[PDB]
Amino acid sequence: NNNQIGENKEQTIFDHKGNVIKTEDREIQIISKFEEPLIVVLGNVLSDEECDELIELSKSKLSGAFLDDNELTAKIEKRISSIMNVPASHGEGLHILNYEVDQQYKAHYDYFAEHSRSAANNRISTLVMYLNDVEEGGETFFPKLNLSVHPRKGMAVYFEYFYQDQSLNELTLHGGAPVTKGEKWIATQWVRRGTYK
Amino acid sequence: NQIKEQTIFDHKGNVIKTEDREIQIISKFEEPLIVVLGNVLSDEECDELIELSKSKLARSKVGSSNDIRTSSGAFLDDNELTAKIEKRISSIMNVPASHGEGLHILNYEVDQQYKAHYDYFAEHSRSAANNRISTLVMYLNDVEEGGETFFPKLNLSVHPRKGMAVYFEYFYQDQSLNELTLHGGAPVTKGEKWIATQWVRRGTYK
Numbered sequence A: 001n002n003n004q005i006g007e008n009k010e011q012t013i014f015d016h017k018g019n020v021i022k023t024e025d026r027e028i029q030i031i032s033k034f035e036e037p038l039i040v041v042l043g044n045v046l047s048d049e050e051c052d053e054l055i056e057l058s059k060s061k062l063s064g065a066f067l068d069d070n071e072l073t074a075k076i077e078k079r080i081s082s083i084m085n086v087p088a089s090h091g092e093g094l095h096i097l098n099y100e101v102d103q104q105y106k107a108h109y110d111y112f113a114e115h116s117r118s119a120a121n122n123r124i125s126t127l128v129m130y131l132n133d134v135e136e137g138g139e140t141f142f143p144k145l146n147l148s149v150h151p152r153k154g155m156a157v158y159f160e161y162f163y164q165d166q167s168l169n170e171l172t173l174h175g176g177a178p179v180t181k182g183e184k185w186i187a188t189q190w191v192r193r194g195t196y197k
Numbered sequence B: 001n002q003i004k005e006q007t008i009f010d011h012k013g014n015v016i017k018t019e020d021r022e023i024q025i026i027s028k029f030e031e032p033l034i035v036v037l038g039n040v041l042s043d044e045e046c047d048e049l050i051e052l053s054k055s056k057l058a059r060s061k062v063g064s065s066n067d068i069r070t071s072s073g074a075f076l077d078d079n080e081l082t083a084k085i086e087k088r089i090s091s092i093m094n095v096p097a098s099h100g101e102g103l104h105i106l107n108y109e110v111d112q113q114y115k116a117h118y119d120y121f122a123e124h125s126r127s128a129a130n131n132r133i134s135t136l137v138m139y140l141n142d143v144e145e146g147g148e149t150f151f152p153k154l155n156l157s158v159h160p161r162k163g164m165a166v167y168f169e170y171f172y173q174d175q176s177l178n179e180l181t182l183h184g185g186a187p188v189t190k191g192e193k194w195i196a197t198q199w200v201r202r203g204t205y206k
């Protein structure tokens, strides 16, 4: 029952210790952390072939679109659940987005306004997975924090917005900067507070 | 019509093409500028640097018997490998290799740490005549737990990952921006940590 040590900080959903996240089928690398709100750059999230397969599944179906469930998407969602420390049933599913040149995603929040039907089971965290390499542009940027993550195939950026202090959630404003050369493919997993699917 | 101080590192885009390798720009903290970089050193280059740091090429002892000091670690005298790596690093850092102090190798064992500090020298010192302006810390091995490079005034950490590096600079006119680059190496709690550091001076050093 010792004295208080350091300042009191809100607990996060992502609570992994160390430099690696050992999932059932892959060891994910913790690359960098912005402490609060928690933004984590992750390495070795998806294999090259998994990235290819997700893009292919996306093209055959066609803003973006969710993939239909199959053995690959369930495998990937299971791995993602280990990273995000929330059961896969809380995720909305693998949503695939393709940016052509000059396309972008203007800054926004991923959680829903309190006064909306969707906020009854609100989003609490996001994982953005880079499915290809982007010749130029396409950074994921957080303008209130002056932090950017640059696309790199197989890597991902994790961030959460489940804080009691709503100003911390409001620091998670983020966008996809315009692609200026090449194209950008991402998969996004948005995680809800409760079971979604 | 007008629409921030300029930086030494001014690379545009997602990669840095050097004479022999394409380095990956992974993440950027804008000001003071801190950049996580991928694909800096190959696995074998990391292993060889570690081995060289235990040879007669080293000028001192690379390992220590809890707080790392400025006498801890060793500079490597020049050979074919170190020159090749310094040439690559110079393209990353946008400064000629002759401004670098040379590869400095440091080994941390369990419980060892580098308490938070600045890399630049105090104005009132002989070393400030040709002060340091930027640092590249290259991770030469994997660390299971601990060993993060942390910036306590910015609440940002970079975790060790073999072959990656963190770059940061402290050549700003606004001195408060330089003082935001206070950083350290968090204690290694499982395994060991090997790094190479290149410190770059404003003018020719060697």
Ligand SMILES: O=C(O)CCC(=O)C(=O)O
Pocket (backbone or CB within 6 Å): A097, A105, A110, A126, A128, A138, A139, A140, A141, A174, A175, A176, A177, A186, A188
């Ligand atoms: O394209 C990006 O980098 C950002 C993606 C994003 O904002 C999302 O998928 O929710």
Ligand SMILES: O=C(O)CCC(=O)C(=O)O
Pocket (backbone or CB within 6 Å): B114, B119, B135, B137, B147, B148, B149, B150, B183, B184, B185, B186, B195, B197
């Ligand atoms: O060990 C680290 O992560 C940081 C080392 C450092 O601060 C330096 O090499 O100058």
Ligand SMILES: [K+]
Pocket (backbone or CB within 6 Å): B069, B070, B071, B072, B073, B074, B104
């Ligand atoms: K030293």
